[PDB]
Amino acid sequence: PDYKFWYTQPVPKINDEFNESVNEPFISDNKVEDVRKDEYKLPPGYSWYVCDVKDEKDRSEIYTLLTDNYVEDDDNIFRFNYSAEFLLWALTSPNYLKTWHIGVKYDASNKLIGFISAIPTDICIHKRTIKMAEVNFLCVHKTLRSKRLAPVLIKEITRRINLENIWQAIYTAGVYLPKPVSDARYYHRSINVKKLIEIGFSSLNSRLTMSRAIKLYRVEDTLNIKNMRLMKKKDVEGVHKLLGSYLEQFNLYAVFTKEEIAHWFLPIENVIYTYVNEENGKIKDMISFYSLPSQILGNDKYSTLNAAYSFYNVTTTATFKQLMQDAILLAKRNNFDVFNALEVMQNKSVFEDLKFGEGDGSLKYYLYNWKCASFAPAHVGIVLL
Ligand SMILES: CCCCCCCCCCCCCC(=O)SCCNC(=O)CCNC(=O)[C@H](O)C(C)(C)COP(=O)(O)OP(=O)(O)OC[C@H]1O[C@@H](n2cnc3c(N)ncnc32)[C@H](O)[C@@H]1OP(=O)(O)O
Ligand SMILES: Cc1nn(C)c(C)c1CCOc1c(-c2ccc3c(c2)c(CN(C)C)nn3C)ccc(F)c1F
Ligand SMILES: [Cl-]
Numbered sequence: 001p002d003y004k005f006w007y008t009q010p011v012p013k014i015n016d017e018f019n020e021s022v023n024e025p026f027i028s029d030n031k032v033e034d035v036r037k038d039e040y041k042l043p044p045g046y047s048w049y050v051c052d053v054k055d056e057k058d059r060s061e062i063y064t065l066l067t068d069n070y071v072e073d074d075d076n077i078f079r080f081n082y083s084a085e086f087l088l089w090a091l092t093s094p095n096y097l098k099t100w101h102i103g104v105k106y107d108a109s110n111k112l113i114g115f116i117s118a119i120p121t122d123i124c125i126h127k128r129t130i131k132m133a134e135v136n137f138l139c140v141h142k143t144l145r146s147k148r149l150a151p152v153l154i155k156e157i158t159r160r161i162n163l164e165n166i167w168q169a170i171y172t173a174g175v176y177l178p179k180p181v182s183d184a185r186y187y188h189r190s191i192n193v194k195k196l197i198e199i200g201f202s203s204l205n206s207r208l209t210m211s212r213a214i215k216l217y218r219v220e221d222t223l224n225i226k227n228m229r230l231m232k233k234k235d236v237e238g239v240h241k242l243l244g245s246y247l248e249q250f251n252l253y254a255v256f257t258k259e260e261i262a263h264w265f266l267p268i269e270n271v272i273y274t275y276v277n278e279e280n281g282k283i284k285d286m287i288s289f290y291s292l293p294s295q296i297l298g299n300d301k302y303s304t305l306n307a308a309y310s311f312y313n314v315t316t317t318a319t320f321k322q323l324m325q326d327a328i329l330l331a332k333r334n335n336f337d338v339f340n341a342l343e344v345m346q347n348k349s350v351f352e353d354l355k356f357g358e359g360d361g362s363l364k365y366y367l368y369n370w371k372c373a374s375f376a377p378a379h380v381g382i383v384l385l
Contacts, residue, residue, distance in 0.1 A: 003177070003178055005148075005151045005154075006177055006178045007178065009368070010026035010027050010368065010369040011026070011177075011178050011179060011366070011367075011368060011369070012179035013178055013179065014178050014179060016178075016179060016371075017373075017374070018371050018372055018373050019373055020126070020372075020373045022371055022372060022373065023125065023126045023128055023370075023371075023372045023373075024370070024371060024372075025167065025168065025369050025370055025371070026369050026370070026371055027369055030162070030165075030167045032163065032164075032165045035159060035162045035163050036159055037163075039156060039159075040152050040155050040159065041152075042104060042152060043147075043149075045106060045107050045108060046104050046105065046106055046107065046113070046114075047104070047105050047107055048102065048103070048104060048105075048156070049102075049103035049104065049105045049112065050098060050099060050101065050102065050103070051098075051101045051102070051103045051112075051115070052098060052101075053087060053088060053091045053092060053098075053101050054088070054092065056084075059084050059087060059088060060084060061103070061111075061112045062084075062087055062103070062112065062115055062137075063082070063083070063084040063087060064112075065103075065112045065113070065114075065115055065139055065141070066080070066081075066082055066115070066137065066139055067079075067081050067082075067295065068141075068142070069139055069140070069141050069142050070082070070137075070139050072297075073294075073360065074360050074361055075360075076297065077199075077200060077296070077297060078201075078294035078295065078296060078297065078305060079294060079295045079297060080292060080293075080294055081293045081295040081304065082292060083271070083291070083293070085268065085270065085271055086270075086271045086290070086291065086292070086385075087137075089263075089268060089271050089272060090119075090136070090137075090385045091117055091119060091137075093119045093120075093121075093260065093263050094257065094259045094260050094263055095120055096119050096120065097160075097164065099160055100117060100118040100120075100133070100157060100160055100161065101117050102115070102117070102153065102157055102160070103115050104149070104153070113140070113141040113144055114139065114140050114141065114144070114149055114153055115137055115138070115153075116135070116137065116139075116153040116154065116156075116157050117135070117136055117137045117138075117157075118133035118134060118135045118157055118161055118169065119133070119134050119136075120132070120133060120134075120164075120166065121133075121134050121170075121254050121260075122254065122255040122257075123168070123170050123252070123253075123254055123255070123382075124248075124252070124253050124254070124255050125181075125251070125252055125367065125370060125372060126251055126252075126372055126373070129255055130168050130370075131166055131168075132166065132168045132169050132170050132367075133157075133161045133166055133168075133169040133170075134169070134170050134171070134384060135157065135169050135170070135171040135368075136171070136384060136385060138150060138153060138154070140153075158368075167369055168367060168368060168369050168370050169367070169368035169369070170252075170365070170366070170367055170368075170382070170384070171366050171368065171384070172363050172364060172365050172366065172384045173363070173364055173366065174361055174362070174363060174364070175364075176364060177364070177366065179366075179374075180364040180365060180366060181252065181365050181366065181367055181372065181374050181375065182251075182252065182344075182364075182365045182374060182375050182376065182377050182379065182380045183362050183363075183364050183365070183377060184342040184343050184344050184362055184363050184364075184365070184377035184380060185342070185343050185358060185359060185361070185362045185377075186340060186341070186342050186343075186359040186361070186362065186363060187340070187341055187342075187343065187347075187348075187351050187356040187357060187358055187359055188201075188339070188340055188356060188357050188359055189217075189338065189339040189340075189341070189354060189355060189356045189357075190202055190213075190338060190355070190357070191217065191219075191328070191331065191332050191336060191337055191338055191339060192336075192337040192338070193213050193214055193216075193217045194210065194214065195302060195305075195337055196337060197210070197213070198301065198302070199296050199299055199301075199302050199305065201305065201338070202357070216355065217355060219325075219328060219332060220329075221329065221332075221333075222329075223326045223329060223330075224318055224322040224323070224325055224326050225277045225285055225315075225317065225318055225322070225323070225326055227277050227278065227279075228275045228276070228277050228285070228287065228326055229275060229276060229277075229278075230267050230273075230275060230276075231265055231266060231267055231274040231275065231276050231286070232266075233262065233266065235276050235278065235283055236258055236261050236262045236265075236266070237258065238276070238278070238281075238282055238283030239261050239265055239274070239276065239283050239286055240256065240257075240258045240261045241283070242283045242284065242285075242286055242314050243256065243261070243286065243312055243314055244256060246314040247381045249381070250345065250379055250380060250381025250382075251379040251380070251381070252365065252375075252379070252380050252381060252382055253381035253382050254382050265286075265288055265312075270291050271290065271291055272288070272289075272290045272291070272311070273288060273289050273290070273291070273308070273330065273331075273334060274286060274287070274288040274311075275287045275288070275326075275330055277317065279317070284315075284316045285314065285315045285316060285317055285318060285323060286312065286313065286314050287313050287326060287327045287330060288311040288312050288313065289308040289309055289310055289311050289327060289330075289331055289339070290308070290309050290311050290385065291306070291307070291308060291309075291336070292307055292309050292385075293305060293306055293307060294307060305338065306335060306336050306337045306338075307336060307337060307338050307339075307340055308331035308334070308336040308338070308339050308340065309340045309341075309383075310324075310327065310339065310340065310341035310342070310347065310383070311383055312383065313327055313345075320346045320349065320350060321349075321350045321353055321354065324341075324347070324350045324354055325354060327339065328354065340359075341356065342363060342377065342380075342383065343377045343378070344377050344378065344380040344381070344382075344383065345378065345380065345381055346378070348378060365377075365380060365382075
């Protein structure tokens with residue numbers, strides 16, 4: 001309603017809208033020399049802490065903070081449980097900066113109570129490519145909510161990003177803020193349907209008995225693209241071409257270098273899965289999904305929902321439906337309970353046929369210090385972790 005913090009920031013007002021001829025910063029001609037060199041003031045008893053995510057102990061402190069205090073679903077039934085190895089992968093992409101991994105400690109206990117992170121990436125927005133920061137993993141301890149700590153974290157990481165002569169950022173949130181460039185509902189494809197029913201993720205009715213639900217979501221254990229196999233280092237050049245060509249159609253996407261392709265797609269158990277179809281030495285199809293479990297709050301039988309999240313998928317030798325059918329199958333083969341996807345890129349066109357259910361909310365895409373026309377989520381070509 002009031003947006004007292006966000007209306008001090010270079011972002012659109014709630015009722016602002018720009019036509020497609022507008023694609024530029026709110027504030028231009030920024031000078032690194034004029035950026036503040038002092039850290040933002042914290043309340044007494046709290047201090048900034050630079051986290052070394054490559055140090056197991058520092059990384060474990062971040063892991064604990066998020067496990068206990070990060071995103072929950074709208075009904076406080078699930079809480080994200082990013083693994084420590086996932087956080088390593090998500091935060092140490094090519095040319096990342098340690099000083100963009102910012103913690104807040106409570107001095108008396110020496111314990112982390114706040115975190116925010118960014119990584120650098122080239123972002124193409126309406127065909128214009130801008131060096132940006134991708135902001136993620138903003139988290140304040142549950143006991144310290146609504147004390148205006150989040151604006152301090154946001155202003156401090158803004159300052160540190162500006163020190164590197166970067167003046168734009170991309171971020172996503174479930175909360176509505178000024179002002180989304182796009183808004184994407186999420187959908188869920190049941191794989192282990194008995195577990196999903198028992199934990200309250202899915203439901204039954206008189207027409208859909210347990211046995212009927214299990215049969216509805218049963219899948220054939222045979223791939224439409226028979227040679228889909230785990231990506232290897234030799235495939236980096238081919239994935240770079242296949243995905244890079246595909247993404248140029250969208251209004252918002254990351255312009256991956258080959259080093260970034262290797263980092264974001266080479267498979268890591270329980271973190272990132274990429275499968276490729278190689279034909280005549282060329283990569284002609286790819287499937288990828290990442291592992292993001294949710295802790296199941298207060299369930300005595302199951303502690304974790306094992307969820308695969310659709311990442312980037314491209315096909316040239318099958319239909320997109322056939323490709324995403326294989327994606328579901330590959331997630332099932334890797335013991336995931338549910339396959340989750342946003343209505344971005346071509347995804348929505350397969351949701352009905354492949355038996356996805358609509359979820360309870362949406363993920364909003366935002367840019368910082370950029371004015372441009374908004375667009376439908378099918379024009380979004382980027383997925384943030
Ligand atoms: C050039 C470089 C620029 C770099 C920066 C680019 C921007 C990056 C922006 C960050 C991108 C994050 C990407 C992700 O990580 S999205 C993941 C967000 N994390 C969670 O949801 C975890 C669980 N919740 C929490 O930890 C806290 O509730 C957080 C920390 C989220 C808010 O803490 P708290 O609830 O204790 O609130 P407060 O009293 O301190 O602060 C209230 C103010 O903060 C605004 N708020 C609330 N939630 C969010 C949110 N998710 N993005 C942006 N702003 C948010 C809110 O509208 C209000 O402002 P205004 O309404 O009064 O104006
Ligand atoms: C399961 C589950 N367990 N928990 C704890 C939730 C919230 C869910 C729903 C997940 O919804 C998503 C999200 C999705 C939706 C909201 C999100 C997120 C992802 C993120 C993480 N990144 C993108 C910032 N933050 N927020 C607020 C992104 C892509 C999807 F395909 C989803 F199904
Ligand atoms: Cl200020």
